[PDB]
Amino acid sequence: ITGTSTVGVGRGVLGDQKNINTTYSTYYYLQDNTRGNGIFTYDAKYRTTLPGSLWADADNQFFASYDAPAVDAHYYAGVTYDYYKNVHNRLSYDGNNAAIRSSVHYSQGYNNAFWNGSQMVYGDGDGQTFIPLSGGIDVVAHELTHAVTDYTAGLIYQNESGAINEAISDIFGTLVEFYANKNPDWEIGEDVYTPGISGDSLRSMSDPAKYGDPDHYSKRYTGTQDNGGVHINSGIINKAAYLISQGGTHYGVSVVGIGRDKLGKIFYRALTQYLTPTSNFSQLRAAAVQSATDLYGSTSQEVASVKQAFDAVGVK
Numbered sequence: 119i120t121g122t123s124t125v126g127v128g129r130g131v132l133g134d135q136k137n138i139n140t141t142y143s144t145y146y147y148l149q150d151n152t153r154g155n156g157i158f159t160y161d162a163k164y165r166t167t168l169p170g171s172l173w174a175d176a177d178n179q180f181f182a183s184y185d186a187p188a189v190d191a192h193y194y195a196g197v198t199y200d201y202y203k204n205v206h207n208r209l210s211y212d213g214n215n216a217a218i219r220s221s222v223h224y225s226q227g228y229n230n231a232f233w234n235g236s237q238m239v240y241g242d243g244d245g246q247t248f249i250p251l252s253g254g255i256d257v258v259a260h261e262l263t264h265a266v267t268d269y270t271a272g273l274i275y276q277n278e279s280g281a282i283n284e285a286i287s288d289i290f291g292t293l294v295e296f297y298a299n300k301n302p303d304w305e306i307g308e309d310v311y312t313p314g315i316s317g318d319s320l321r322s323m324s325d326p327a328k329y330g331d332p333d334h335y336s337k338r339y340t341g342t343q344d345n346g347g348v349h350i351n352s353g354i355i356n357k358a359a360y361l362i363s364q365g366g367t368h369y370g371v372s373v374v375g376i377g378r379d380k381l382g383k384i385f386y387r388a389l390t391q392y393l394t395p396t397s398n399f400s401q402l403r404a405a406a407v408q409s410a411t412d413l414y415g416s417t418s419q420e421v422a423s424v425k426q427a428f429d430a431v432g433v434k
């Protein structure tokens with residue numbers, strides 16, 4: 119909508135207060151004009167029609183329980199925008215400041231979130247498996263990262279290319295969580311998963327096997343569930359990324375860590391310069407090796423660490 123830029127205040131899913139960028143024209147709308155062509159947050163009103171209505175509020179205060187998922191979808195889309203812009207010099211998901219659109223209150227009891235090709239979509243959860251999923255910065259950034267992958271490598275959402283697509287979203291979702299730096303970790307979705315259970319998460323990058331996901335290529339899933347295991351086999355790449363950043367010894371193979379910033383630079387360059395829609399895990403290794411070579415030199419520690427990490431997870 120056309121209007122004047124304003125700053126509202128609200129509470130997110132976990133009860134934390136934050137300022138949000140709004141637009142005033144009769145109502146205050148969840149429209150942030152300060153980032154590219156805008157960040158726009160919508161109310162799906164417990165239905166499945168998308169996007170629903172641009173979120174309108176009478177007073178620019180967003181403290182109602184119903185408001186919380188909207189607050190966080192909006193705010194964490196902004197943080198994600200800022201990460202890509204400030205860290206990778208990327209302007210929105212398409213690199214040309216495309217508008218970022220999110221809908222909250224999708225369906226009833228919906229225990230998921232997704233990128234639908236055009237926008238982000240968040241369920242409220244059923245209150246047992248999940249609380250509203252926009253409460254997780256890693257979740258928000260994971261979903262927005264699918265848009266980045268759509269516009270870049272375009273990894274096909276099936277089998278190995280699909281597992282890479284998922285891993286890229288877990289890697290950058292995690293790096294955005296570290297960027298914001300509020301109790302960051304190498305786990306996915308802990309802030310919105312199972313409110314009744316402390317200390318769990320949907321997936322772990324540091325130990326994928328804690329939630330039954332493979333941590334070595336020899337344990338890969340080759341069945342048909344989950345588009346050929348895209349959320350399962352992602353653990354193999356997630357583990358490699360974790361090892362590249364943090365180091366460790368895994369099935370007897372030692373990896374010298376090079377840290378998160380370098381992990382992000384290597385994988386951002388791989389994603390945007392070398393991966394293609396059909397890339398498999400072996401091709402990801404080559405892309406990461408070439409990217410690290412470009413950035414740091416062929417005999418560098420960074421290249422050595424990329425190679426050791428993929429060796430450690432069985433990807434040649």
Ligand SMILES: N[C@@H](CCCC[NH3+])C(=O)O
Binds near residue numbers: 229230231320349
């Ligand atoms: N995002 C994952 C996990 C959701 C958990 C199941 N409700 C998937 O779509 O497979």
Ligand SMILES: [Ca+2]
Binds near residue numbers: 176178179181
């Ligand atoms: Ca209000």
Ligand SMILES: [Ca+2]
Binds near residue numbers: 295300301302303308
């Ligand atoms: Ca965390």
Ligand SMILES: [Ca+2]
Binds near residue numbers: 256292304305307308
């Ligand atoms: Ca996390």
Ligand SMILES: [Ca+2]
Binds near residue numbers: 314316317318
């Ligand atoms: Ca939990």
Ligand SMILES: [Zn+2]
Binds near residue numbers: 260261264284287
């Ligand atoms: Zn995903």
